[PDB]
């Protein structure tokens, strides 16, 4: 009796469980590196640190490409900007220029710590008004980090109540929603198989994103001055200026649409990533009062109430620094990073990988590898401290919250500063507790282009100790 012709085979059910976890689980059958073919496209998935470091660092430039996706084309205005731009002159220029911009913010009025703290100060005054109430803290945090990224990009901020903030939240949620159903990694290309309105809806939100950023950049052409380079748009316009002095080869690279998309990548990631990690952290603290208590003891013992926290306090608030590390481990913002692509014929783990092959680093697998981590599925900030609680250790080499190599995160410094000061200022002022109905946040998460957490509410109360210290 005969066996059936097989025209197709997938290792696991699509749209069942988080992709990143399905790939991980599948290593128990197939090892830390395996591929899948979808028509002509081949994708390689890699779930061990050594192989990952090879893809990101040792052979970084071989695999520094980005695959093309119909969805990422719309958000990137056809692979302009930085994150979804393929390897090439454009990407290199803008990545470098965006990196150069952050370097500015080391000193003076536009020192990064002082910018963040001004916005955190507002946030906390605002949250304090909700004393005794249970709220979703998303929008307040969104506002705070949006003003920061706006300052970095434009040296402008939004006034309290500016309806533009709401317009931005709307299109951000709309784009993230339609950019991918779940993660960026789709085994089956569902959107090209059945009738649907995904690209239409995505274009609509991006169009509002673009029109908005266009007015800002239009208006700023009147304000640009070559003797005043203090933000990212300055930096970018200076480059276009210097290029056109017949025009340089960088001239094509810096059209207004190029500048716009890069600003968009930076504006989008400056809000969505950090707002998200803040929510995750609070979520984990609601689930672990014992950790949360010790963060209060720590921040009262090393900072007290004479003054507000400072970047300098990273020295003493070690458990807080450890807590942040652990969230970035347990719930990485990008658990499969952003997809990479083989720029040339190369190899991983001595296996052949052809030009154009998509390569995906399963960061989730690295952070949950049993042989590299003690009880990986547990929230344990202590793992990032020595047993004495006196300083910060790196307990595993299988840890890359911010990527590495040519495509590593360019916003890490900003991220780490925002994350640490937001959590420090909040913990100094507020008791952050479970709402009156007793609902805890689901820690499962919602994987999109970023690893989001479901909306949830936190009962916020002004601390006794903070109050008593106002005299
Ligand atoms: C909690 C905060 C953040 C985390 C954990 C994080 C982590 C990451 C990761 C894992 C990647 C992918 C690396 C790869 O594809 O190989 C990435 C890329 C990137 N990040 Fe972030 N990031 C964070 C915040 C930010 C912020 C605040 C910015 C602000 C500008 C930013 C800008 C970017 C950009 C532009 C890329 C694309 C790099 C490229 O394609 O060259 N990120 N980040
Ligand atoms: C999709 C978007 C959010 C909504 C809107 O603003 C449009 C933007 C367009 C750019 C996107 C952005 C989402 C985070 C991204 C993908 C990101 C990132 C991700 C995870 C960790 N570090 C950086 C680099 C580019 C960023």
Curated annotation (Swiss-Prot):
One Pfam family here: p450
UniProt-listed Enzyme Commission number(s): 1.14.14.19, 1.14.14.32
Family listed: Belongs to the cytochrome P450 family.
Residues in coiled coil: none
Gene Ontology CC annotations of this record: axon; endoplasmic reticulum; endoplasmic reticulum membrane; neuronal cell body
Gene Ontology molecular function, alphabetical: heme binding; iron ion binding; lyase activity; oxygen binding; steroid 17-alpha-monooxygenase activity
InterPro entries recorded: Cyt_P450, Cyt_P450_CS, Cyt_P450_E_grp-I, Cyt_P450_sf
Organism domain of life: Eukaryota
Keywords from the UniProt entry: Congenital adrenal hyperplasia, Disease variant, Endoplasmic reticulum, Heme, Iron, Lipid metabolism, Lyase, Membrane, Metal-binding, Microsome, Monooxygenase, Oxidoreductase, Phosphoprotein, Steroidogenesis
Any one Gene Ontology BP term: androgen biosynthetic process
Enzyme class, UniProt record, top EC level: oxidoreductase
Description of how activity is regulated: Regulated predominantly by intracellular cAMP levels. The 17,20-lyase activity is stimulated by cytochrome b5, which acts as an allosteric effector increasing the Vmax of the lyase activity.
Alphabetized PROSITE patterns for the sequence: CYTOCHROME_P450 (PS00086)
Sequence positions that bind substrate: 172
Protein name: Steroid 17-alpha-hydroxylase/17,20 lyase
Known role: A cytochrome P450 monooxygenase involved in corticoid and androgen biosynthesis. Catalyzes 17-alpha hydroxylation of C21 steroids, which is common for both pathways. A second oxidative step, required only for androgen synthesis, involves an acyl-carbon cleavage. The 17-alpha hydroxy intermediates, as part of adrenal glucocorticoids biosynthesis pathway, are precursors of cortisol.
Claim: Zinc is one of the keywords in the record: no
Catalytic activity from the UniProt record: a C21-steroid + reduced [NADPH--hemoprotein reductase] + O2 = a 17alpha-hydroxy-C21-steroid + oxidized [NADPH--hemoprotein reductase] + H2O + H(+); progesterone + reduced [NADPH--hemoprotein reductase] + O2 = 17alpha-hydroxyprogesterone + oxidized [NADPH--hemoprotein reductase] + H2O + H(+); pregnenolone + reduced [NADPH--hemoprotein reductase] + O2 = 17alpha-hydroxypregnenolone + oxidized [NADPH--hemoprotein reductase] + H2O + H(+); 17alpha-hydroxyprogesterone + reduced [NADPH--hemoprotein reductase] + O2 = androst-4-ene-3,17-dione + acetate + oxidized [NADPH--hemoprotein reductase] + H2O + 2 H(+)
Functional pathway: Steroid hormone biosynthesis; Steroid biosynthesis; glucocorticoid biosynthesis
Cofactor(s) the protein requires to work: heme
Result of changing residue 384 to C: In AH5; ablates both 17,20-lyase activity and 17alpha-hydroxylase activity; loss of heme-binding and loss of phosphorylation
PTM: Phosphorylation is necessary for 17,20-lyase, but not for 17-alpha-hydroxylase activity.
Subcellular locations according to the entry: Endoplasmic reticulum membrane; Microsome membrane
Residues the entry annotates as binding heme: 409
Disease link: Adrenal hyperplasia 5: A form of congenital adrenal hyperplasia, a common recessive disease due to defective synthesis of cortisol. Congenital adrenal hyperplasia is characterized by androgen excess leading to ambiguous genitalia in affected females, rapid somatic growth during childhood in both sexes with premature closure of the epiphyses and short adult stature.
């Amino acid at each position: 009796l005969l066996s059936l012709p097989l025209v197709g085979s997938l290792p696991f059910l699509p749209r069942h469980g988080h992709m990143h976890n399905n790939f991980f689980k599948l290593q128990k059958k197939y090892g830390p590196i395996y591929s899948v073919r979808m028509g002509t496209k081949t994708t390689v998935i890699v779930g061990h640190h050594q192989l990952a470091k090879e893809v990101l660092i040792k052979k970084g430039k071989d695999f520094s490409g980005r695959p093309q996706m119909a969805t990422l084309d719309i958000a990137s205005n056809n692979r302009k900007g930085i994150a979804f731009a393929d390897s090439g002159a454009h990407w290199q220029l803008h990545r470098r220029l965006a990196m150069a911009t952050f370097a500015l913010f080391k000193d003076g009025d536009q020192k990064l710590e002082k910018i963040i703290c001004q916005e955190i100060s507002t946030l906390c005054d605002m949250l304090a008004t909700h004393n005794g109430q249970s709220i979703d803290i998303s929008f307040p945090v969104f506002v705070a980090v949006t003003n920061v990224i706006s300052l970095i990009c434009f040296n402008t901020s939004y006034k309290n109540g500016d309806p533009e903030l709401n317009v931005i939240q709307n299109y951000n949620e709309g784009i993230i929603d339609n950019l991918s159903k779940d993660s960026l990694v789709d085994l089956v290309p569902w959107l090209k198989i059945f009738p649907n309105k995904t690209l239409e809806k995505l274009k609509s939100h991006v169009k509002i994103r673009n029109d908005l950023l266009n007015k800002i950049l239009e208006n700023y052409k009147e304000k640009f001055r070559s003797d005043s380079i203090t933000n990212m748009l300055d930096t970018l316009m200076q480059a276009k200026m210097n290029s056109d002095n017949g025009p340089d080869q960088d001239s094509e690279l810096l059209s207004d649409n190029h500048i716009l998309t890069t600003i968009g990548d930076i504006f989008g990631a400056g809000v969505e990533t950090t707002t998200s990690v803040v929510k995750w952290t609070l979520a984990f603290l609601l689930h672990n009062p014992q950790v949360k208590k010790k963060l209060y003891e720590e921040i009262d013992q090393n900072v007290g109430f004479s003054r507000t926290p400072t970047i300098s306090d990273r020295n003493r608030l070690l458990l807080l620094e450890a807590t942040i590390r652990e969230v970035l481990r347990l719930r990485p913002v990008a658990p499969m990073l952003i997809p990479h692509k083989a720029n040339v014929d190369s190899s991983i783990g001595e296996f052949a990988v052809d030009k154009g092959t998509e390569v995906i680093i399963n960061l989730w697998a690295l952070h949950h590898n049993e042989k590299e981590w003690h009880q990986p599925d547990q929230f344990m900030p202590e793992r990032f401290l020595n047993p004495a609680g006196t300083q910060l250790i790196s307990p595993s080499v299988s840890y890359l919250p911010f990527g590495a190599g040519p495509r590593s995160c360019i916003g890490e410094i900003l991220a780490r500063q925002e994350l640490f000061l937001i959590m420090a200022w909040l913990l100094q002022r507020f008791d952050l507790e479970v709402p009156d109905d007793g609902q805890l946040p689901s820690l499962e998460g919602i994987p999109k282009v970023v690893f989001l957490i479901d909306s949830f509410k936190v009962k916020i109360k002004v601390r006794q100790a903070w109050r008593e210290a106002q005299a």
